[PDB]
Amino acid sequence: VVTEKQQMLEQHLQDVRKRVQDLEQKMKVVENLQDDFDFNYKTLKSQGDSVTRQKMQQLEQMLTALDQMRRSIVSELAGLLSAMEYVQKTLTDEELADWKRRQQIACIGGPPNICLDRLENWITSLAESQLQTRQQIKKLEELQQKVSYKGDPIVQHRPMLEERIVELFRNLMKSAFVVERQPCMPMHPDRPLVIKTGVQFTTKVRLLVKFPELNYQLKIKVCIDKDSGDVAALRGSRKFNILGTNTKVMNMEESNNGSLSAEFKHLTLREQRCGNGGRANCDASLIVTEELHLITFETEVYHQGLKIDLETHSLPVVVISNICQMPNAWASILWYNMLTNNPKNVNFFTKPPIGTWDQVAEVLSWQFSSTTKRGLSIEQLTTLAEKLLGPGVNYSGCQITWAKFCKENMAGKGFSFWVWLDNIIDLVKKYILALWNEGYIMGFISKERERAILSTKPPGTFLLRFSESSKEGGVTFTWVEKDISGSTQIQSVEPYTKQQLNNMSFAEIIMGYKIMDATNILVSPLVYLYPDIPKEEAFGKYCRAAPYLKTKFICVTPF
Amino acid sequence: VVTEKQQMLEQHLQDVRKRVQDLEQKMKVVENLQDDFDFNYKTLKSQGDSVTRQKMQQLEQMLTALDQMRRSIVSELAGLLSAMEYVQKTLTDEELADWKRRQQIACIGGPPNICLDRLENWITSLAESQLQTRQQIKKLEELQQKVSYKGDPIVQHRPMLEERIVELFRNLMKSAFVVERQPCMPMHPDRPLVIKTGVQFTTKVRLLVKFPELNYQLKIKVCIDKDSGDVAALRGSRKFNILGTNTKVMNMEESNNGSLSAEFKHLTLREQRCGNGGRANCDASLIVTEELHLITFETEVYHQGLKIDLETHSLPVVVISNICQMPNAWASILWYNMLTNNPKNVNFFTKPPIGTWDQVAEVLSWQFSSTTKRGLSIEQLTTLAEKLLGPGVNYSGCQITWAKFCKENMAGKGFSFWVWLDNIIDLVKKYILALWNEGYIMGFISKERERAILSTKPPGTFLLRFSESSKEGGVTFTWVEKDISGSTQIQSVEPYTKQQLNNMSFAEIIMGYKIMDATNILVSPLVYLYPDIPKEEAFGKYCRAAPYLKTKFICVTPF
DNA sequence: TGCATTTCCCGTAAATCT
DNA sequence: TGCATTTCCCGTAAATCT
């Protein structure tokens, strides 16, 4: 929906249109007058060998009128130029920049609407206004070539009018060239900005100035690690090359608005082996999953007498060689986009900024509502804000470092926070996908707060959560049955590794698991998911000459 | 061990050595005599301006003696040449050819000893004998340049002596260039002659003439589909190129004998895309797994004034693009090597020859004693000779077509004989490897002959065999428990797909599987593997603040 | 050496050829 | 169309770099 500021921009853009139209009218009038004066001047010489000299008076009066129209025109153009100069800034440095920011957020799973139609409509409108304005200025020039005098306002102001309009257009064209769709592997739609060597990836650029005359006219060339893989920047980085179709003609294909776009599919990266530089120097100058690269797009436009060089680039990209590097790669992308709006800080991880728990907790939620049906409840969130910060109340402004989030392992484990969570999110797909679904799982709750269940709810009531001390990821639950039941001693079962969920689904385990107490007594799974919901309404849904004895496996704990 | 024929060849080779040595002696003598005659002749002219003319008599008598030695020499050389010509044939067309045949057999899992040391020793001996013989012939030539007369036996016979010796050597060099190790992917050691595009493969050539002078002198170039991927041969075939290090210098590296060899590692195939020809025409002119190619090796040798071009090639190779094509590819390799000794019949599958059950049953056994500890007992074999030929007694000379073996599916199934068996052999590795082992499994036995167990042996006695009606492969057993036991109604359980053996091993199932009869009655697995061996002696060997309830799964049939 | 990182490649699934 | 065949590429394991 349209904000107030966007209402205003739209209004200004129409005011600009109107002034251009008023000027056009004024040019038509001044030119007809100039034609009339030109004709009368000649007719008067056809006899310059009766009191027929009010014509001389007519001739002088027309001339005076022309001068006045010319001053008026030149004065209005200057005014229009200044207005354009003010508004173009609102358009490019504010609205478009807000769009660039929201693209960052959308990449990391945030609230989308990275729609370019409005911007394209604004940008195109202004561009049309500017070209028509340039043509008026050019007309003033040809009018002067036919009729001029001492003090002619066209001779004194036109050059500056040209310069200003060329500068506005030249700059609007450059801002209008953007990356509509960041480098991403079709196999990992939720993981843009992470490229694996050898695997195909696509990316798309757009030119927000919707000029049909330019259809199929521009050739866009893409490359990675342009020039900066030399001097006056980072050092020790791996360097890469793009394989596949390197260039692409921009066109208004695929219908939808008929926007000028250029899409590159089947692109591939390969490491550029050989050469030298250094490579070492303190922690090898950034681990591979913290090194950042830029994919650059370039072309040139020749239009109505002008040559304009256009260049744009993707957001920093992490390049990996194997998929096992994806989790850390993603953490770098999360962190970068979560905390900076700088679109080309390739050195970002030299000294990474610190985040607040607020910003990190939002990001973590998105990572769930991406791959799945829904995010994270505070019951899951807060009891994870603890995992990183232990005891405490209200984490609002609590700082979280890159080290704490991903670069280093958690307090007493051999793996990092993010990698552990990424493994959950993974697992909660390949298996238990459907089962995670809407709200059937607690997932993140400390044994202490986990005690506040059977300790307050009736025997049978269970709760669902993840393996908190395993790298690859696992899932479990709660129940009370053993010995003589002192005061209901809460229990859990050894985590099921990915392989363990290939045999039976988690809700198949919940709805089909007894307990072999002592001997022969094979009791049962416990009723009522946490509040008071009997297991069935929630889990009973994801369940399902001759012969040979048809079979099915079950585990069931044997003490 | 040395056959009688090999004893003889060795003997002939030594006779050849001896004659060369006797000739050398004879050359030494004739040359000293020629020196003496030459000297005396001059001494006699130093006075040809006392009865000092018995010297003239001495001079003539020396000359006569020289002529006689020369006739004798020329006569013995001709004789040696003929002997060499006879023996070289025994060496190249018989012993070496037998070695080429045994290489075929070894490739398809047969009885090895494809050892080249003997051949190399024979070949090298003959080569040395021939070069020394060539040098004598050359010496006769220089002797003639100094002393000649009318009827000189050197002038009349030498040219033919040269021609014959050059021909023998030139041909021995060519036969001596062989493929010691056929194209094979290191990842599939039991599958030589089957190459997958993109995957590395190695191959090695040897030059059986062990001349140290040639160390590091020859450059061997390898290629695939040489010239024949043009005219006067097959048509519609895919064409390929070799990627990686295309050439390799031959040397006496890796110690062992110091044989001249050249090994190519990290070779890769890629389809040569584009062009034309036809491609279609009747069944697309051979399915991809029946198309055959040749990897050719070439080099040239310049030695002691001779230029000799050497060329050799691998056995026909099948080129696949995906591993799922391996089973059919292998069947083509089996069939080819089982039934022909032609080393370059690329059209073989145009009209494939027919095999006898004997030859096929041997081959099938090897395929087991390759990947595993041991082959196939007739109890398994014969009851598989039936699967292909049904009812019958003594299959000795029963014909088996390519269609029946692999090209077409079995009678009432959607898959072929060989592909089914290859899947067993596979399965009997990834899982049940250890378990297949020596003699614990029947594996192949028709329900009819399978009845001759509990129908003669006491309740409990079980038998082990494979899923006869599943493409991917499976395993099962026998036992009697259900209803009220009419007369012990033999039973089996639904086959366990590859995934089903990832949870519990087959012998873990045998030693840990009860039967849930009616309700709560969970009986047990049956004792005594087929004869009278209690399950345990055979299968019991492959079996094996806090906390969390440690777990293990079991299936057990629930009627 | 052990670590960080890349390469190798099967096997499943999707794409392409015919 | 459905079939034959190749390409894509994850993920496990081995190789290489440092």
Curated annotation (Swiss-Prot), chains A, B:
- Gene inactivation effect: Early embryonic lethality, day 6.5-7.5. Conditional, tissue specific mutants are variably viable and show diverse defects including obesity, diabetes, thermal dysregulation and infertility.
Residues annotated with N6-acetyllysine modification: K457, K471, S487, K541, K550
PTM-bearing positions, type Phosphothreonine? T557
> What happens after mutating R465A?
No effect on nuclear localization
Its localization reads: Cytoplasm; Nucleus
Induction is noted as: Induced by methicillin-resistant S.aureus infection in the lung.
Post-translational modification Phosphotyrosine, affected residues: Y496, Y548
- Its primary localisation, in coarse terms, equals cytoplasm
Q: Which GO terms describe its molecular function?
A: acetylation-dependent protein binding; CCR5 chemokine receptor binding; chromatin DNA binding; DNA binding; DNA-binding transcription activator activity, RNA polymerase II-specific; DNA-binding transcription factor activity; DNA-binding transcription factor activity, RNA polymerase II-specific; DNA-binding transcription factor binding
Some GO term, biological process aspect, for this entry: which one? negative regulation of hydrogen peroxide biosynthetic process
Outcome following mutation: F39W: No effect on nuclear import
* Domain annotation SH2: ranges: 436-526
Describe tissue expression.
Answer: Expressed in ventricular cardiomyocytes (at protein level). Expressed in the lung (at protein level). Expressed in the liver, spleen and kidney.
Motif Essential for nuclear import — list its residue ranges.
15-27
Q: What PTMs does it carry?
A: Activated through tyrosine phosphorylation by BMX. Tyrosine phosphorylated in response to IL6, IL11, CNTF, LIF, KITLG/SCF, CSF1, EGF, PDGF, IFN-alpha, LEP and OSM. Activated KIT promotes phosphorylation on tyrosine residues and subsequent translocation to the nucleus. Tyrosine phosphorylated in response to constitutively activated FGFR1, FGFR2, FGFR3 and FGFR4. Phosphorylated on serine upon DNA damage, probably by ATM or ATR. Serine phosphorylation is important for the formation of stable DNA-binding STAT3 homodimers and maximal transcriptional activity.
Is Acetylation tagged as a keyword? yes
Q: What's this protein's function? A: Signal transducer and transcription activator that mediates cellular responses to interleukins, KITLG/SCF, LEP and other growth factors. Once activated, recruits coactivators, such as NCOA1 or MED1, to the promoter region of the target gene. May mediate cellular responses to activated FGFR1, FGFR2, FGFR3 and FGFR4. Upon activation of IL6ST/gp130 signaling by interleukin-6 (IL6), binds to the IL6-responsive elements identified in the promoters of various acute-phase protein genes. Activated by IL31 through IL31RA.
Question: Further notes on this entry?
Answer: Involved in the gp130-mediated signaling pathway.
| Subunit record text | Forms a homodimer or a heterodimer with a related family member (at least STAT1). Component of a promoter-binding complex composed of STAT3, NFATC3 and NFATC4; complex formation is enhanced by calcineurin. Interacts with IL31RA, NCOA1, PELP1, SIPAR, SOCS7, STATIP1 and TMF1. Interacts with IL23R in presence of IL23. Interacts (via SH2 domain) with NLK. Interacts with ARL2BP; the interaction is enhanced by LIF and JAK1 expression. Interacts with KPNA4 and KPNA5; KPNA4 may be the primary mediator of nuclear import.
As for family, the record states: Belongs to the transcription factor STAT family.
Task: Please report the name of this protein according to its UniProt entry.
Answer: Signal transducer and activator of transcription 3
Species the sequence originates in: Mus musculus
Q: Lineage of this protein's species?
A: Eukaryota, Metazoa, Chordata, Craniata, Vertebrata
Name of the gene encoding the protein in the UniProt record: Stat3
Entire protein: which part is shown?
Answer: 136 to 715 of 770
